[PDB]
Amino acid sequence: KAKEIRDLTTSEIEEQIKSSKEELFNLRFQLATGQLEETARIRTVRKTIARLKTVAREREIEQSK
């Protein structure tokens, strides 16, 4: 998942960020209830958010020059 991101509009980038955060908050918020058995899934999510914001920032630069 590196150039799935490059296929975006610079506006869809925001929405998948938000929805990924709600996905996450669902998991974090279940997590102390113990409903969750999945452990390593969260890393994938948080890393995705890192990617989306990274690329958004890079294009933020190259839309500045």
Partner 1 sequence: EARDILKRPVITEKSSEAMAEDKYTFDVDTRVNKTQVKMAVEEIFNVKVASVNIMNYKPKKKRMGRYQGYTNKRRKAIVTLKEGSIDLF
Residue number with CB closer to partner 1 (10 or 31): 31
Q: Does 4 bind RNA (CB under 7 A)?
A: no
Contact set for RNA, span 31-50 (CB under 7 A): 37-41, 44
| Nearer residue to RNA within complex by CB, 9 or 57 | 57
Break positions in the chain: residue before each gap, C to N over 2.5 angstroms:
none
CB of 8 to RNA, least distance (A): 17
How far is 26 from 22, CA to CA, in rounded Å?
6
Instruction: For residues 25 and 63, give the distance between their C-alpha atoms in angstroms, rounded to a whole number.
Output: 32
